[PDB]
Design an enzyme around this catalytic site. Structure first.
Site, PDB file in Angstrom:
ATOM      1  N   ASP A  80       1.139  -4.054  12.442  1.00  9.50           N
ATOM      2  CA  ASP A  80       1.872  -5.598  12.153  1.00  9.50           C
ATOM      3  C   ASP A  80       1.027  -6.208  11.049  1.00  9.50           C
ATOM      4  O   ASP A  80       0.840  -6.018   9.887  1.00  9.50           O
ATOM      5  CB  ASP A  80       1.689  -6.541  13.314  1.00  9.50           C
ATOM      6  CG  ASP A  80       3.079  -5.986  14.355  1.00  9.50           C
ATOM      7  OD1 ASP A  80       3.010  -5.338  15.125  1.00  9.50           O
ATOM      8  OD2 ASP A  80       4.056  -7.037  14.186  1.00  9.50           O
ATOM      9  N   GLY A 137      -6.541   4.123   1.676  1.00  7.56           N
ATOM     10  CA  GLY A 137      -5.168   3.386   1.546  1.00  7.56           C
ATOM     11  C   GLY A 137      -4.772   3.014   0.131  1.00  7.56           C
ATOM     12  O   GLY A 137      -3.712   2.731  -0.038  1.00  7.56           O
TER      13      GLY A 137
HETATM   14  C1  LIG Z   1      -0.254   3.379   7.672  1.00  6.56           C
HETATM   15  O1  LIG Z   1      -1.887   3.884   8.163  1.00  6.56           O
HETATM   16  C2  LIG Z   1      -2.702   4.143   7.384  1.00  6.56           C
HETATM   17  C3  LIG Z   1      -2.232   4.850   6.066  1.00  6.56           C
HETATM   18  C4  LIG Z   1      -2.862   5.307   5.326  1.00  6.56           C
HETATM   19  S1  LIG Z   1      -2.701   6.240   3.690  1.00  6.56           S
HETATM   20  C5  LIG Z   1      -0.792   5.666   3.560  1.00  6.56           C
HETATM   21  C6  LIG Z   1      -4.352   5.491   5.520  1.00  6.56           C
HETATM   22  C7  LIG Z   1      -4.879   4.628   6.877  1.00  6.56           C
HETATM   23  C8  LIG Z   1      -4.135   4.219   7.693  1.00  6.56           C
HETATM   24  C9  LIG Z   1      -4.528   3.536   8.757  1.00  6.56           C
HETATM   25  O2  LIG Z   1      -5.427   4.243   9.470  1.00  6.56           O
HETATM   26  N1  LIG Z   1      -4.409   2.259   8.701  1.00  6.56           N
HETATM   27  C10 LIG Z   1      -4.954   1.496  10.155  1.00  6.56           C
HETATM   28  C11 LIG Z   1      -5.925   0.195   9.705  1.00  6.56           C
HETATM   29  C12 LIG Z   1      -4.864  -0.645   8.957  1.00  6.56           C
HETATM   30  C13 LIG Z   1      -5.869  -1.615   8.313  1.00  6.56           C
HETATM   31  C14 LIG Z   1      -6.624  -2.556   9.559  1.00  6.56           C
HETATM   32  C15 LIG Z   1      -7.829  -2.639   9.836  1.00  6.56           C
HETATM   33  C16 LIG Z   1      -8.421  -3.335  10.873  1.00  6.56           C
HETATM   34  C17 LIG Z   1      -7.620  -4.027  11.755  1.00  6.56           C
HETATM   35  C18 LIG Z   1      -6.147  -3.952  11.386  1.00  6.56           C
HETATM   36  C19 LIG Z   1      -5.652  -3.281  10.133  1.00  6.56           C
HETATM   37  C20 LIG Z   1      -4.504   0.279   7.482  1.00  6.56           C
HETATM   38  C21 LIG Z   1      -3.716   1.349   8.084  1.00  6.56           C
END
Ligand SMILES: COc1cc(SC)ccc1C(=O)N1CCC(Cc2ccccc2)CC1
Length: 333
Positions: free
Chosen positions: A164, A27
């Protein structure tokens, strides 16, 4: 209590159960301290998020509690929820770090879509999933308020979960600082996203705040008499009457060549008066989604008690409440 190990990634120290292997950052910081990992328990790839300074202050602690409570409550295929939550601490006094685990989707909508037009079937599938998740979130009496492509976690197969310029998807009532808004602020964002998937173009790419509103009102018209009657502030009304007055465009003349049912849905989502905007549940029943809609598989959330938002507690209280929620977590089947 599992065996933990320590690893340094992007100058951040991670202490995680040996269950989670092959940590690698993901990310580029946009989502906080987040690593992808391999969950040896399930053979699935997961995202692990290390909360930042969770109990440094009352505000951080209450934010930590807020985030953990919400993610613990969200149990829906199209909403980010929790596979795990853990802390290396073995007691409340030691407790100072919170890690969250969810399914790794690995991209946001924009990385998947790459600003191309999608086929009408592909748009149905993506928007259907956004609305199915939004119906769930809204049934918990939660408003997202910042739905936009980068808050949609999407894998290569366009399976989507809601997490969220930053302002291109925001409802006009938020841009205009109206003091009351309803859940359909999120439906506005959905309409903006759907338009962009159909056309390959951002619907309202304003250069700045004022320009954003001008682009919106050129499409949806300046407020009708029925909406103006609901604006309590004389200056806000005078402000609104100060703007260049514009009649609403016919969306069939804007989204040329789109499926007429998509245009109809857009018309119902992009209504200026948010009291007249379609809700998520209504939209799911719209004929545009006939191929995907299943009224018996569009579940709603349990009632979600947000009363903690009104409380003013001490740091150690928020921390103890958060520790209780870590301890009580039950992983999904
Ligand atoms: C838009 O989602 C993404 C975007 C990208 S590059 C634009 C890469 C990876 C993801 C992706 O898989 N995410 C899911 C997990 C999120 C963090 C989290 C961890 C644990 C519990 C709650 C929240 C971050 C985003």
């Amino acid at each position: 209590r599992p065996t933990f190990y320590r690893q340094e990634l992007n100058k951040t120290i991670w202490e995680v159960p040996e269950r989670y292997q092959n940590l690698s950052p993901v990310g580029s910081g946009a989502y906080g301290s987040v690593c992808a990992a391999f969950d040896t328990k399930t053979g699935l790839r997961v995202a692990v998020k290390k909360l930042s300074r969770p109990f440094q202050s009352i505000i951080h602690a209450k934010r930590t509690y807020r985030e953990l409570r919400l993610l613990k409550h969200m149990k829906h295929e199209n909403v980010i929820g929790l596979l795990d939550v853990f802390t290396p601490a073995r007691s409340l006094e030691e407790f100072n770090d919170v890690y969250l685990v969810t399914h790794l989707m690995g991209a946001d909508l924009n990385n998947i879509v790459k600003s191309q037009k999608l086929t009408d079937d592909h748009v149905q599938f993506l928007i259907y999933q956004i609305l199915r998740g939004l119906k769930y979130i809204h049934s918990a009496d939660i408003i997202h308020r910042d739905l936009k492509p980068s808050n949609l976690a999407v894998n290569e197969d366009s399976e989507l979960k809601i997490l969220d310029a930053t302002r291109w998807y925001r409802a006009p009532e938020i841009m205009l600082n109206w003091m009351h808004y309803n859940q359909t602020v999120d439906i506005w964002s959905v309409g903006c996203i759907m338009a962009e998937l159909l056309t390959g173009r951002t619907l309202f790419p304003g250069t700045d705040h004022i320009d954003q509103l001008k682009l919106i009102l050129r499409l949806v018209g300046t407020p009708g008499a029925e909406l103006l009657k609901k604006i309590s502030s004389e200056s806000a009304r005078n402000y609104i009457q100060s703007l260049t007055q514009m009649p609403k465009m016919n969306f069939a003349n804007v989204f040329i060549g789109a499926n007429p049912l998509a245009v109809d849905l857009l018309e119902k989502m992009l209504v200026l008066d948010s009291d007249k905007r379609i809700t998520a549940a209504q939209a799911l029943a719209h004929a545009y989604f006939a191929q995907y809609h299943d009224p018996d598989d569009e579940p709603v959330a349990d009632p979600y008690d947000q009363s903690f938002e009104s409380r003013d507690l001490l740091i150690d209280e928020w921390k103890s409440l958060t520790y209780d929620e870590v301890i009580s977590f039950v992983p999904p089947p």
